[PDB]
Amino acid sequence: MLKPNVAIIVAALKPALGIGYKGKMPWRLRKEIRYFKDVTTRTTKPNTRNAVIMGRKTWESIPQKFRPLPDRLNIILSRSYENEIIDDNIIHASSIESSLNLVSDVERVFIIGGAEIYNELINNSLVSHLLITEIEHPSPESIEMDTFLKFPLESWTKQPKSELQKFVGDTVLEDDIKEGDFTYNYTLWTRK
Ligand SMILES: NC(=O)C1=CN([C@@H]2O[C@H](COP(=O)(O)OP(=O)(O)OC[C@H]3O[C@@H](n4cnc5c(N)ncnc54)[C@H](OP(=O)(O)O)[C@@H]3O)[C@@H](O)[C@H]2O)C=CC1
Ligand SMILES: Nc1nc(N)c2c(Cl)c(N)ccc2n1
């Protein structure tokens, strides 16, 4: 696959854009996990699938019994890996672009984390869209976080919900979803 458009998908707590703590997500938002699953799995073309790219630490954080993520091509990046097709669902690679050379019959490509991957790949011009779940809490400072997004948002434009809807197709997008003390909304951003 040559120069595909790539999307980053992440959930962050405003205003600092915290995304983790000691290797885990600092929240368990049931509806959000379901949205992640649907957006990253659904395709429109016929015999295609989407590809999810992640850092080695992220891969290792998924219980072995629950990986690879089903119904998607999984690509794991490590600076120590040789470009290798493990099986039909798993690819090992040392760079995003090399990994993409190994794929065919992929519709969309998503970067799913973690922090290091995100903070590095945001500056790669292959990244054309950001799907950011913006999470709000009454006392954000009470949530322990050690990992944050460092995205140059001044170079990106948040699109209206209509554009997000068009992006996701059929997926139901509820507004101001509440789960415990968290309130969240899905958003789409494109480069200026
Ligand atoms: N809020 C959210 O939506 C999400 C949050 N996260 C959070 O992220 C955190 C984990 O992030 P982090 O620890 O940084 O882990 P990552 O998943 O980003 O893995 C980092 C590893 O990826 C490899 N890697 C990193 N950059 C590159 C590169 N540019 N090219 C090739 N390989 C590269 C390296 O592997 P090697 O060392 O083998 O070279 C590095 O050690 C947790 O807190 C987790 O909860 C994760 C996903 C979503
Ligand atoms: N928005 C969004 N983005 C991710 N990358 C997510 C991941 Cl990897 C897990 N595991 C769960 C929810 C997510 N939610």
Which residue, among 104, 107, 155, 99, has the nearest Cα to 7 in the 3D structure? 107
Ligand 2 mean position, distance from CA 87 (Å): 24
Cα angle 85-69-40, degrees, rounded to a multiple of 5: 105
The domain that contains 161 carries what CATH number?
3.40.430.10
Ligand 1 mean position, distance from CA 78 (Å): 9
Atom of ligand 1 nearest to the CA of 22: 43
- Identify the three-state secondary structure at position 130: strand
Which residue, among 100, 25, 39, 93, has the nearest Cα to 69 in the 3D structure? 39
Residue 87 amino acid letter: D
Nearest Cα residue to atom 9 of ligand 2? 33
Nearest Cα residue to atom 4 of ligand 2? 10
Domains held by the chain: number: 1
Residue-number span of the structural domain to which 90 is assigned = 1-192
Cis peptide before 114 (omega within 30 of 0): yes
- Tokens at residue 12, please? 């962050």
